[PDB]
Amino acid sequence: SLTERHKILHRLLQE
Amino acid sequence: SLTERHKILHRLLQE
Amino acid sequence: PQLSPEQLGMIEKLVAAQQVTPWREARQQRFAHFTELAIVSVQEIVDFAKQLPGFLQLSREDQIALLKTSAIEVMLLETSRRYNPGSESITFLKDFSYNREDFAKAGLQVEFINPIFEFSRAMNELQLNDAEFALLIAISIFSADRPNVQDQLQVERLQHTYVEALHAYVSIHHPHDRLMFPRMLMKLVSLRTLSSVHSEQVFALRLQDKKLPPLLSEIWDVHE
Amino acid sequence: PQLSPEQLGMIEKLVAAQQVTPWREARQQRFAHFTELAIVSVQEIVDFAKQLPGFLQLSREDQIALLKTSAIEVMLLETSRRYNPGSESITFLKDFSYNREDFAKAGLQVEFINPIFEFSRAMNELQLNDAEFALLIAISIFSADRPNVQDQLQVERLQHTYVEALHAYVSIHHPHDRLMFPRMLMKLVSLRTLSSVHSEQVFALRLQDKKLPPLLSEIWDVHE
Ligand SMILES: CC(C)(C)OC(=O)c1c(COc2ccc(-c3ccc(CC(=O)O)cc3)cc2)ccc(C(F)(F)F)c1O
Ligand SMILES: CC(C)(C)OC(=O)c1c(COc2ccc(-c3ccc(CC(=O)O)cc3)cc2)ccc(C(F)(F)F)c1O
DSSP chain C: -PPPHHHHHHHHHHHHHT------HHHHHHHHHHHHHHHHHHHHHHHHHHTSTTGGGS-HHHHHHHHHHHHHHHHHHHHHHTEETTTTEEEETTTEEEEHHHHHHTT--HHHHHHHHHHHHHHHHT---HHHHHHHHHHHHT-TTSTT-S-HHHHHHHHHHHHHHHHHHHHHHSTT-TTHHHHHHHHHHHHHHHHHHHHHHHHHHHHTT-PPPHHHHHHH----
CA atoms within 13 A on the CB side of C148: 15
- Residue C102: beta bridge partners? none
Ligand 1 pocket check for C37: Cβ under 6 Å: yes
Whether residue C203 contacts residue D203, with contact meaning beta carbons closer than 8 Å, is answered with no
- Beta strands D83-84 and D89-92, pairing class: antiparallel
CA atoms within 13 A on the CB side of C115: 24
In the chain, the amino acid numbered D60 is R
* DSSP 8-class letter at A7: H
Ligand 1 pocket check for C144: Cβ under 6 Å: no
Q: What distance in Å separates the CA atoms of residue D99 and residue D79, rounded to the nearest whole number?
A: 11
* Residue C132 lies in domain: 1-224
Query: What dihedral angle (degrees, nearest 10) is formed by the CA atoms of D86, D88, D94, D96?
Result: -130
User: Could B12 and C43 be called an inter-chain contact, meaning their C-beta atoms sit closer than 8 Å?
Assistant: yes
CB nearest B10 (choices: C64, C65, C223):
C64
- Of C55, C174, C191, the C-alpha closest to C136 is C191
Closest-approach residue (CA) in chain C for B1: C61
Kindly report the CATH number assigned to the domain that includes residue C49.
1.10.565.10
CA atoms within 13 A on the CB side of C109: 14
Whether residue C135 contacts residue C169, with contact meaning beta carbons closer than 8 Å, is answered with yes
Q: What distance in Å separates the CA atoms of residue D125 and residue D11, rounded to the nearest whole number?
A: 23
Best probe of the C interface among D192, D203, D222, by most C CBs < 10 A, is D192
* DSSP 8-class letter at A6: -
Q: What distance in Å separates the CA atoms of residue C39 and residue D203, rounded to the nearest whole number?
A: 32
Residues of D in CB contact (< 8 Å) with C are: 1, 118-119, 122, 143-145, 159-160, 163-164, 167, 178-179, 182-183, 185-186, 188-193, 195-196, 199
* DSSP 8-class letter at A4: H
3-state secondary structure of A5: helix
3-state secondary structure of B9: helix
**CA D25 to chain CA centroid, nearest Å:** 30
> If 0-12 CB within 10 Å is exposed, 13-18 middle and 19+ buried, where does residue C194 land?
buried
In the chain, the amino acid numbered D47 is D
Taking CA atoms only, the protein residue closest to ligand 2 atom 26 is: D38
3-state secondary structure of B4: helix
Q: What distance in Å separates the CA atoms of residue C75 and residue C71, rounded to the nearest whole number?
A: 6
Run of H or E including A10: helix A7-14
Whether residue C163 contacts residue C221, with contact meaning beta carbons closer than 8 Å, is answered with no
Please give the C-alpha separations between residue C52 and each of C56, C134, C164, D72, in angstroms, as whole numbers: 8, 10, 15, 35
Residues across chain C: 224
Please give the C-alpha separations between residue C9 and each of C13, C14, C16, D13, D154, in angstroms, as whole numbers: 6, 9, 10, 44, 39
* DSSP 8-class letter at A3: H
Whether residue C194 contacts residue C73, with contact meaning beta carbons closer than 8 Å, is answered with yes
Determine how many CB atoms are found less than 10 A away from the CB of residue C74: 23
**CA D128 to chain CA centroid, nearest Å:** 14
- Residue C10: partners with Cβ closer than 8 Å, 6 or more residues away: C53, C161, C165
The structure was resolved experimentally with X-ray
Phi-psi region for residue C146, left (φ > 0), alpha (ψ -120 to 50) or beta? beta
What one-character-per-residue DSSP string does chain D give?
A: -PPPHHHHHHHHHHHHHT------HHHHHHHHHHHHHHHHHHHHHHHHHHHSTTGGGS-HHHHHHHHHHHHHHHHHHHHHHTEETTTTEEEETTTEEEEHHHHHHTT--HHHHHHHHHHHHHHHHT---HHHHHHHHHHHHT-TTSTT-S-HHHHHHHHHHHHHHHHHHHHHHSTT-TTHHHHHHHHHHHHHHHHHHHHHHHHHHHHTT-PPPHHHHHHH----
Whether residue D190 contacts residue C145, with contact meaning beta carbons closer than 8 Å, is answered with yes
Whether residue C194 contacts residue C115, with contact meaning beta carbons closer than 8 Å, is answered with yes
User: Could D160 and C143 be called an inter-chain contact, meaning their C-beta atoms sit closer than 8 Å?
Assistant: no
Cβ neighbours of C118 in D, within 8 Å: 145
Total domains present in chain D: 1
- Residue D201: partners with Cβ closer than 8 Å, 6 or more residues away: D108, D109, D111, D112
Taking CA atoms only, the protein residue closest to ligand 2 atom 31 is: D202
Q: What distance in Å separates the CA atoms of residue D218 and residue C70, rounded to the nearest whole number?
A: 33
The CB-based long-range contact list for D184-188 (8 Å cut-off, 24+ gap) reads D184/D126, D184/D128, D184/D132, D184/D136, D185/C182, D185/C185, D185/C186, D185/D139, D186/C159, D186/C163, D186/C185, D186/C188, D187/D119, D187/D122, D187/D123, D187/D126, D187/D136, D188/C186, D188/C189, D188/D73, D188/D136, D188/D139, D188/D140
Q: Ligand nearest C116 Cα, by number?
A: 1
Helix C152-173 with C5-17: angle, nearest 10 deg: 100
Q: Ligand nearest C107 Cα, by number?
A: 1
- Measuring from each residue's beta carbon to the nearest atom of ligand 2, which residues come in under 6 Å? D 34-35, 37-38, 40-41, 72, 75-76, 78-79, 82, 92-93, 107-108, 116, 198, 201-202, 205, 212, 220
Cβ neighbours of C190 in D, within 8 Å: 145, 192
User: Could A10 and D60 be called an inter-chain contact, meaning their C-beta atoms sit closer than 8 Å?
Assistant: yes
Determine how many CB atoms are found less than 10 A away from the CB of residue C26: 8
Q: How far is C32 from chain B (nearest CA, A)?
A: 18
Ligand 1 pocket check for C102: Cβ under 6 Å: no
Q: What distance in Å separates the CA atoms of residue C141 and residue C113, rounded to the nearest whole number?
A: 23
For the CA of C107, the closest atom of ligand 1 is 33
Q: What is the resolution of this structure in A?
A: 2.8
User: Could C61 and B5 be called an inter-chain contact, meaning their C-beta atoms sit closer than 8 Å?
Assistant: no
What phi and psi, each to the nearest 5 degrees, are found at residue D124? -70, -30
Q: How far is B9 from chain C (nearest CA, A)?
A: 7
First to last CA, chain C: 47
Residues C162-171 as b/e (b if ≥16 CB within 10 A, e otherwise) read: bbbbbbbbbb
Q: What distance in Å separates the CA atoms of residue C31 and residue C107, rounded to the nearest whole number?
A: 5
Residues across chain D: 224
